[PDB]
Amino acid sequence: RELSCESYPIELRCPGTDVIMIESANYGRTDDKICDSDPAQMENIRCYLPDAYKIMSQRCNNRTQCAVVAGPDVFPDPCPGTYKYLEVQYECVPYKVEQKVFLCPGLLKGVYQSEHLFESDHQSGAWCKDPLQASDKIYYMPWTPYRTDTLTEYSSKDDFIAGRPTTTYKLPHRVDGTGFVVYDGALFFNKERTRNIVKFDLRTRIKSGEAIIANANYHDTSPYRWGGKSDIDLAVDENGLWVIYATEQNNGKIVISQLNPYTLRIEGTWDTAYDKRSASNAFMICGILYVVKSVYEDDDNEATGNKIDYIYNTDQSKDSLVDVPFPNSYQYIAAVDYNPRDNLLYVWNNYHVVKYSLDFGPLDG
Amino acid sequence: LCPGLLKGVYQSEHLFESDHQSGAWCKDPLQASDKIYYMPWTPYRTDTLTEYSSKDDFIAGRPTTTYKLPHRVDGTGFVVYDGALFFNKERTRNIVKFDLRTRIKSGEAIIANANYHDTSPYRWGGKSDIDLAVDENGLWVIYATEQNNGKIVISQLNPYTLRIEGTWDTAYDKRSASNAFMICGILYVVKSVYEDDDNEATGNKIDYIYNTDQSKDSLVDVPFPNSYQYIAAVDYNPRDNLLYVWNNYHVVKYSLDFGPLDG
Amino acid sequence: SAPGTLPHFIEEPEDAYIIKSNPIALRCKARPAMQIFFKCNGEWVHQNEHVSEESLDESSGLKVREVFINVTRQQVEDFHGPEDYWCQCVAWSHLGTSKSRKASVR
Amino acid sequence: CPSVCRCDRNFVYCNERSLTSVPLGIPEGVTVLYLHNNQINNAGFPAELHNVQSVHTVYLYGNQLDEFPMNLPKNVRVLHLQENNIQTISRAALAQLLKLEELHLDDNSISTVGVEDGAFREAISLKLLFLSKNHLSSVPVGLPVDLQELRVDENRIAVISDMAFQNLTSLERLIVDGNLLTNKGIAEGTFSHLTKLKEFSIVRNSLSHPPPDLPGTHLIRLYLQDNQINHIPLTAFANLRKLERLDISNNQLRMLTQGVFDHLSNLKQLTARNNPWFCDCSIKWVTEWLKYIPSSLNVRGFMCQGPEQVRGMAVRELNMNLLSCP
Ligand SMILES: [Ca+2]
Ligand SMILES: [Ca+2]
Ligand code: NA
Ligand code: NA
């Protein structure tokens, strides 16, 4: 077992070629006599962090050596004005990794039509499934201008078509756009008339955080082609959680940044050459951006679109021009989001609720 | 020993209103004693079992002794078998055997391909991926595997050798189900409406049954009593032939009706 | 005969700090005032929380009002906003309204 | 095209550039103008901006203003003046924007006295109006006749006059939630004159009973949450034959008089969570009503609080036929 006081990095190492297997991780205070600081901070011995195991598992597991910095950069603060410690128990298991679910499928080649659910009453909307949790739960947020604030849960695929809702979550702050995503039983919905990402846990039905995206344009300043205050899109892939936005420093062009789901901070910034208003939608797959360009209702002397014409890698920091055909059966595309578990696209296109199938290559790089 | 096939579940006893929204309570059927084993459920903090001398001491709030468990408990699947507590270990698919008389661990069994830690729990969740049931046949493990596509999988576990003595796969999904209990090797799946689900208005009834001896399933319509909405855990006792239901903050005991319809 | 003007703050809210879970209240004084209410983190505070005291100052001619609001440790730790727990105060008059300093409770 | 500002196609970007005044070089082919998150004051507004007829949408949120801006573009439909400090509203500043339809004035310092008599009425084409998180003591009098959506929530409103909701016959949605309103503060039949009203919400207020005399001609949604309602009268819900959604949760209700929901035939949903429902003989109508209710109408929230024998239980199902009650 390993222990470390606040603002100090913890060192975990397995002998030979073995792998660290985390059993119990608690970032807080259970016993007062452990840390030696000030008695005014040792008064509360009821500090606990449930997310601590999930944080360490992403780093310490599958590796031989891991140095985690026990501070506000990796671990979010549970209670203010209390000195914290990290109690991590671990075993020595062989170097066997789990495939398919965490692994990259390859560089995208074709975006084809999959399922056609219901022709919903709302024109502009979005719908997404929680990839981390192994459940058939379908979230549903229909966007209305200056009136969106209610998330609608569904038990199965059959209950989503027929119209049988499980429960409805009452969101305190108003939603701004169709860029909504769910990550490990929590909603990363964007706030109205602000550049802040509101984190809302579905299990507890209370707000857990709010992160300010630096220099990001908000409230119809730099939305997609159709508009609708879609200035911020939230994509989930094999790498983790991502924020698709636009800054004036990049002259209205698309800016992509990796956001931590626990600490709610930027873990790298990337600038692209494509303009957000020219783009219809965007989705992340293995840290690679896929810009959608499509035809909409009321287009004077235009027919160009229904294609993927821009790609940007985060690991390589290089951009390329592609020509992958995107399906556009209906003109008014609202939201496009990717799910790494099923490897399918969740698309809202002019009232209709549709699902899209994906094709990849035999080599990514 | 076999009383028969279940006909209807009815309200019988109301003890007290506990401070916890989730948990379970059970009596040892093998030992002829009035000992009540209490279990309060708390997320990522469950590790203590409380013992009570009689029914009167359980209502008033007079605990006999508290057992300190070596590992954290996951879900509301708590059961007692011949002076030994059987529980599910946190972040693992392992039943852990703990003898109350000696106050030390005696074994740990690995349930094959079983989903654990909020992967495949009940309707309310709370890491209730693995539930333990006791009947006339013996000890049983109610769980779910990905091979059965998240559907309920029931297996008979030996209380001494800690090994699987047969595997049975069902058609009902564990996430759709509220609670499960075994009576004479027959599974009883409960479907219920929970709290904060204002959209729901459907009746709370038993709609799925599965026999182990026959290996055949049927669709029933037995009315289940639901005074409250947050049904945490349901367990059967063959000695008293009553259900130990934990509904919301309250702790209740249900009466059972039996029929002669059985081969 | 009396002069009518916008509310002028005498005692503006100062930044408070919670020590050993002891709840510390905020002070506010304005003139001419008849109704004084707080706006904690963009939203109004309930009437029952406000403790009004219309004490007439011997120095000043116009009516003076003083309102105090308690800020507990539980209100701060459960708050998961972007900025710190800031408190602003608005006073009412026959001509208009005026806003005071943003006192942040840490 | 300005030097400090960087224009893009048919859009002008002056946002977050620390500007104190609107730039001079404005083209005659721009549709949407962005000037938000700056240090632009009410005095720093050139009159050449008014001449640009092509601009229809102007954004000026999170600035340092004091009064409604002057010399804004002549043919503007949507205007955003939120998160600033506008205290005063004038008649002449709204007469210049005759084509104004949508108007947002959130988180501002707008007071009842500061607003000129009939300033909003000058903007004849005004249908959408937003006066949220402001310092309004009451509802203004000079409101547009063709106004469709009036939002005046999260303010300090205690009194509402009967003449305040005059000529607003063509209003659909009316939001007044998050105020210090009371049943004494509301006039006798003030909302009754709004026949086109489809939605009405007064949540997080101090109402002792639902407001009497309400329009049942077009009303579909009626929200009444976090109020101090002790009881609901038989006439309060009568004639509301077109109502679909009703919510009376987070209230202080013990018993409901029978025949109160008898006139709501179109009702698709009812919410009554967290309420001290004292279950005696008065709840025997609720239990039966919930049993033989059609699938189209959902009812949830009814849970027993008193006595301790029946505490926490659900009103939907009875045990031993409500005891010795019948
Ligand atoms: Ca997307
Ligand atoms: Ca059970
Ligand atoms: Na999205
Ligand atoms: Na059990």
Side-chain angles (χ1 to χ4, degrees):
Chain A
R1 59 188 287 183
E2 269 279 337
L3 285 140
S4 65
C5 305
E6 216 187 296
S7 69
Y8 194 81
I10 197 150
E11 283 189 63
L12 288 95
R13 200 170 265 259
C14 274
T17 48
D18 284 77
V19 150
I20 317 142
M21 205 219 85
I22 312 300
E23 196 185 78
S24 57
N26 187 59
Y27 178 77
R29 195 173 286 272
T30 53
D31 191 89
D32 59 274
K33 283 284 288 175
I34 318 292
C35 301
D36 273 282
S37 301
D38 206 81
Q41 281 84 78
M42 270 125 217
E43 286 184 82
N44 181 65
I45 2 153
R46 294 196 76 155
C47 187
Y48 300 96
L49 195 86
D51 295 283
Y53 178 83
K54 294 169 187 176
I55 294 156
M56 295 292 267
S57 292
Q58 285 180 286
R59 299 160 86 99
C60 294
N61 294 345
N62 306 320
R63 292 175 73 93
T64 316
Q65 61 93 70
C66 195
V68 183
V69 183
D73 297 282
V74 193
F75 287 91
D77 176 57
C79 63
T82 300
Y83 210 78
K84 295 153 281 169
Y85 64 88
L86 187 69
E87 203 187 284
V88 169
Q89 285 171 60
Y90 61 100
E91 284 173 76
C92 300
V93 298
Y95 60 102
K96 282 187 177 182
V97 291
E98 284 181 70
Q99 295 173 291
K100 295 280 173 185
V101 54
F102 299 98
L103 274 156
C104 155
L107 193 80
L108 188 85
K109 278 181 165 187
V111 185
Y112 319 118
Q113 277 200 96
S114 202
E115 308 169 55
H116 172 260
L117 299 111
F118 65 112
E119 195 197 290
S120 188
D121 54 299
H122 289 83
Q123 190 196 56
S124 304
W127 67 295
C128 61
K129 282 189 86 183
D130 201 40
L132 292 98
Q133 285 184 296
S135 186
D136 295 285
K137 282 185 179 181
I138 296 119
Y139 306 102
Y140 171 78
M141 227 199 278
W143 181 87
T144 319
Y146 316 97
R147 266 183 264 173
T148 318
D149 65 267
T150 47
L151 195 266
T152 316
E153 209 183 74
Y154 286 88
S155 60
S156 62
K157 206 183 273 179
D158 301 73
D159 292 280
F160 188 62
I161 307 156
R164 255 176 264 97
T166 304
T167 187
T168 302
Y169 302 94
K170 225 280 173 180
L171 303 157
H173 288 313
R174 290 178 189 266
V175 196
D176 231 17
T178 59
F180 100 94
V181 91
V182 183
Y183 202 94
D184 199 76
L187 167 60
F188 284 89
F189 84 89
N190 174 233
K191 216 187 146 180
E192 200 171 272
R193 295 157 165 85
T194 25
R195 43 167 62 100
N196 316 346
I197 306 296
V198 187
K199 192 188 162 78
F200 183 83
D201 187 67
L202 307 157
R203 189 185 66 89
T204 53
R205 290 171 177 266
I206 52 107
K207 195 209 268 184
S208 57
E210 209 177 307
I212 313 145
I213 314 298
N215 304 299
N217 289 121
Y218 60 93
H219 206 90
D220 253 2
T221 305
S222 298
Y224 286 112
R225 183 136 122 92
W226 68 277
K229 286 94 194 168
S230 307
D231 301 54
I232 299 130
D233 196 77
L234 280 115
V236 172
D237 60 7
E238 286 77 6
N239 293 40
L241 192 92
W242 297 86
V243 184
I244 305 155
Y245 61 99
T247 61
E248 206 92 92
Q249 286 80 11
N250 205 24
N251 298 76
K253 293 168 182 75
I254 307 147
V255 183
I256 48 159
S257 294
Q258 194 178 55
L259 187 88
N260 194 277
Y262 312 99
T263 47
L264 304 127
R265 289 170 79 176
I266 308 291
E267 294 178 299
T269 313
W270 291 270
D271 295 83
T272 75
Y274 209 92
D275 197 281
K276 214 174 180 285
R277 283 170 295 112
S278 301
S280 299
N281 221 270
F283 58 97
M284 294 289 285
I285 312 165
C286 314
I288 310 134
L289 184 73
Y290 296 95
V291 170
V292 194
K293 193 190 181 180
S294 67
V295 128
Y296 281 88
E297 276 183 285
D298 180 76
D299 260 66
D300 188 83
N301 206 76
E302 280 204 303
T304 54
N306 328 324
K307 286 170 188 180
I308 304 294
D309 60 325
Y310 190 84
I311 55 143
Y312 191 89
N313 200 299
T314 52
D315 298 81
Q316 289 181 89
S317 298
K318 205 180 179 74
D319 60 278
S320 299
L321 285 138
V322 291
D323 196 280
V324 168
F326 194 85
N328 191 84
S329 300
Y330 325 102
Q331 270 72 264
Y332 220 87
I333 288 174
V336 181
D337 290 287
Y338 174 76
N339 189 278
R341 184 185 275 266
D342 49 66
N343 304 90
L344 304 156
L345 281 177
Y346 290 78
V347 183
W348 190 286
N349 191 13
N350 192 71
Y351 302 95
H352 296 260
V353 182
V354 286
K355 222 178 194 178
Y356 285 163
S357 58
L358 301 169
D359 194 278
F360 308 97
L363 272 142
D364 187 63
Chain B
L1 275 154
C2 170
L5 195 93
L6 210 79
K7 282 180 89 183
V9 192
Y10 316 99
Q11 285 186 260
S12 181
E13 286 177 79
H14 177 263
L15 306 110
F16 68 99
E17 191 190 302
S18 184
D19 297 72
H20 296 93
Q21 206 184 79
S22 300
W25 73 295
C26 60
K27 281 188 86 182
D28 194 45
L30 290 99
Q31 287 184 295
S33 186
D34 295 285
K35 282 185 178 181
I36 298 115
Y37 305 94
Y38 178 81
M39 277 312 287
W41 192 85
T42 51
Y44 314 97
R45 266 187 270 178
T46 312
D47 65 90
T48 39
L49 170 83
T50 318
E51 204 186 76
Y52 286 87
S53 60
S54 62
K55 206 182 271 180
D56 300 73
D57 292 280
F58 188 62
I59 308 153
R62 253 175 265 98
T64 302
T65 187
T66 306
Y67 303 94
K68 226 276 176 183
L69 297 154
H71 303 288
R72 290 180 191 266
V73 208
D74 241 5
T76 52
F78 319 103
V79 106
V80 186
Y81 204 95
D82 199 77
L85 185 84
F86 284 86
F87 71 99
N88 177 235
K89 198 181 170 176
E90 200 170 274
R91 301 167 212 280
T92 27
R93 42 167 62 99
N94 300 17
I95 316 298
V96 193
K97 195 184 162 77
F98 183 83
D99 186 67
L100 307 158
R101 189 185 65 90
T102 53
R103 289 172 178 266
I104 51 106
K105 196 208 268 181
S106 55
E108 209 173 306
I110 313 145
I111 314 297
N113 304 299
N115 289 295
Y116 60 93
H117 206 89
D118 257 359
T119 305
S120 299
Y122 289 108
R123 205 180 174 95
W124 65 277
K127 285 94 193 168
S128 298
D129 298 54
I130 296 128
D131 181 74
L132 285 135
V134 173
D135 60 7
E136 285 77 6
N137 293 40
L139 193 90
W140 296 86
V141 185
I142 305 154
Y143 61 99
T145 61
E146 207 192 278
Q147 286 80 11
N148 205 24
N149 297 77
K151 292 168 182 75
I152 306 147
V153 184
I154 48 159
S155 294
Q156 194 178 55
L157 187 87
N158 193 279
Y160 312 100
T161 54
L162 306 126
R163 289 181 285 186
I164 308 291
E165 294 178 299
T167 313
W168 291 270
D169 296 83
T170 75
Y172 209 92
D173 197 281
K174 211 170 188 283
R175 280 170 305 275
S176 301
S178 300
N179 250 276
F181 59 97
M182 294 289 285
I183 311 165
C184 319
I186 311 135
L187 183 73
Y188 296 95
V189 174
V190 189
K191 192 186 182 179
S192 75
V193 164
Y194 283 85
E195 208 189 68
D196 60 66
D197 306 339
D198 290 68
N199 303 76
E200 280 206 308
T202 54
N204 305 11
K205 293 173 190 77
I206 294 147
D207 63 318
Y208 191 84
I209 55 143
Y210 189 87
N211 200 299
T212 52
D213 298 81
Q214 290 181 90
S215 297
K216 205 180 179 75
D217 60 278
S218 299
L219 285 138
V220 290
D221 193 86
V222 174
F224 201 90
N226 50 291
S227 299
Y228 322 96
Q229 265 67 74
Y230 218 92
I231 302 104
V234 180
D235 292 285
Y236 174 76
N237 190 280
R239 185 184 275 267
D240 49 65
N241 304 90
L242 304 156
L243 283 179
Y244 289 75
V245 185
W246 183 291
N247 201 354
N248 208 24
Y249 293 93
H250 295 254
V251 177
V252 284
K253 210 179 192 181
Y254 282 175
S255 57
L256 300 167
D257 192 84
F258 291 94
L261 289 161
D262 57 87
Chain C
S1 61
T5 188
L6 62 109
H8 185 268
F9 289 92
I10 307 107
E11 283 175 59
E12 281 187 275
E14 208 180 76
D15 299 73
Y17 299 96
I18 193 106
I19 306 139
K20 283 182 179 180
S21 70
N22 296 290
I24 294 129
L26 286 144
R27 295 194 179 186
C28 190
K29 229 174 185 177
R31 180 200 69 103
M34 51 212 76
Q35 276 279 71
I36 287 168
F37 282 91
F38 283 84
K39 212 187 208 288
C40 289
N41 304 277
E43 284 174 86
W44 296 106
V45 191
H46 209 275
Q47 206 177 269
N48 301 330
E49 298 287 289
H50 294 81
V51 182
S52 293
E53 192 77 81
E54 203 175 67
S55 60
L56 291 151
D57 187 40
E58 245 197 287
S59 167
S60 295
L62 283 147
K63 294 187 95 72
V64 190
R65 193 184 179 91
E66 200 169 50
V67 176
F68 311 95
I69 57 111
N70 313 281
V71 180
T72 57
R73 200 190 184 94
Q74 205 176 77
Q75 281 172 272
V76 187
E77 61 196 358
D78 292 323
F79 177 80
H80 298 102
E83 295 169 292
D84 295 87
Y85 199 92
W86 64 272
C87 313
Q88 202 177 57
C89 211
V90 183
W92 270 261
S93 187
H94 296 287
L95 280 151
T97 50
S98 60
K99 288 184 257 182
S100 62
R101 281 190 185 100
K102 285 184 180 183
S104 297
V105 183
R106 295 148 198 173
Chain D
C1 304
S3 294
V4 287
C5 148
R6 291 176 184 269
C7 61
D8 293 88
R9 293 174 183 177
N10 268 55
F11 305 93
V12 159
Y13 291 92
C14 303
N15 50 290
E16 217 160 287
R17 292 173 193 267
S18 300
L19 283 143
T20 51
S21 58
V22 178
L24 295 142
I26 308 300
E28 269 278 349
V30 186
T31 51
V32 188
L33 229 79
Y34 305 100
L35 294 127
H36 60 97
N37 297 311
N38 285 281
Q39 290 163 67
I40 307 157
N41 49 74
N42 60 306
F45 273 92
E48 55 192 77
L49 185 79
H50 188 275
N51 297 314
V52 194
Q53 291 167 88
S54 294
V55 185
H56 74 294
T57 318
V58 188
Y59 291 91
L60 276 148
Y61 55 89
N63 284 255
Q64 288 175 281
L65 284 135
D66 298 283
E67 288 166 23
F68 196 91
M70 274 294 294
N71 301 289
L72 294 158
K74 208 181 179 180
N75 306 134
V76 158
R77 302 157 200 172
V78 189
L79 183 56
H80 290 248
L81 293 158
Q82 60 274 10
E83 288 141 75
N84 43 71
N85 290 80
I86 298 161
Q87 211 166 286
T88 317
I89 301 292
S90 57
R91 289 177 79 174
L94 272 98
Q96 295 177 302
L97 293 100
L98 285 144
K99 285 184 187 178
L100 197 74
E101 292 170 75
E102 200 169 285
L103 185 69
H104 306 267
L105 292 146
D106 304 58
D107 261 287
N108 296 351
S109 59
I110 289 150
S111 190
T112 50
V113 196
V115 176
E116 217 178 314
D117 291 63
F120 296 110
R121 207 151 71 191
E122 285 279 340
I124 49 102
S125 191
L126 204 81
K127 294 156 196 164
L128 279 102
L129 184 65
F130 298 86
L131 291 150
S132 192
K133 286 185 179 184
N134 298 343
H135 320 317
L136 280 133
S137 295
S138 60
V139 173
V141 184
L143 286 161
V145 185
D146 289 282
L147 197 76
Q148 299 184 16
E149 202 186 287
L150 178 62
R151 197 178 285 179
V152 61
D153 69 302
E154 295 276 75
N155 315 286
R156 206 211 65 85
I157 304 154
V159 285
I160 282 170
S161 186
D162 61 291
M163 289 293 282
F165 291 108
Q166 195 197 37
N167 290 86
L168 283 136
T169 323
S170 59
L171 194 92
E172 282 160 64
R173 290 186 72 245
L174 182 63
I175 308 102
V176 281
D177 55 55
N179 294 267
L180 292 160
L181 207 71
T182 51
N183 282 89
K184 290 179 177 182
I186 51 105
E188 192 191 277
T190 182
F191 313 110
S192 61
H193 296 280
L194 295 93
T195 53
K196 285 277 175 184
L197 213 83
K198 288 176 182 178
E199 198 181 298
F200 187 62
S201 180
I202 337 146
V203 311
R204 293 165 276 105
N205 287 249
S206 300
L207 282 149
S208 62
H209 63 270
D213 293 291
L214 282 164
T217 47
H218 283 85
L219 204 73
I220 297 142
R221 302 163 217 266
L222 188 77
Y223 305 99
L224 292 153
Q225 290 92 279
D226 294 77
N227 291 273
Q228 287 91 272
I229 299 157
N230 304 295
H231 88 288
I232 299 154
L234 216 85
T235 51
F237 288 162
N239 297 275
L240 289 154
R241 284 146 78 175
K242 265 203 182 179
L243 202 86
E244 284 168 70
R245 279 188 170 185
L246 178 68
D247 201 332
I248 53 135
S249 59
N250 300 288
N251 280 272
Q252 303 284 290
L253 282 128
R254 281 207 168 188
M255 60 198 84
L256 265 161
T257 182
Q258 201 216 341
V260 71
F261 309 119
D262 276 19
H263 272 273
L264 315 154
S265 60
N266 289 61
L267 206 79
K268 280 187 174 184
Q269 211 193 283
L270 169 66
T271 313
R273 286 200 292 165
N274 297 289
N275 259 257
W277 297 114
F278 217 94
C279 285
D280 307 294
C281 309
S282 58
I283 64 108
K284 220 258 169 178
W285 76 275
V286 188
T287 308
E288 283 289 298
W289 186 68
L290 272 150
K291 281 170 177 179
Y292 314 95
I293 206 79
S295 59
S296 300
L297 170 63
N298 289 283
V299 175
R300 259 276 288 170
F302 287 94
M303 264 166 75
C304 327
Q305 282 273 76
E308 278 77 70
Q309 302 165 80
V310 218
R311 199 181 179 92
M313 287 192 185
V315 188
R316 187 103 68 169
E317 282 183 70
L318 43 79
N319 192 271
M320 286 280 182
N321 199 39
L322 233 288
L323 296 148
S324 297
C325 176

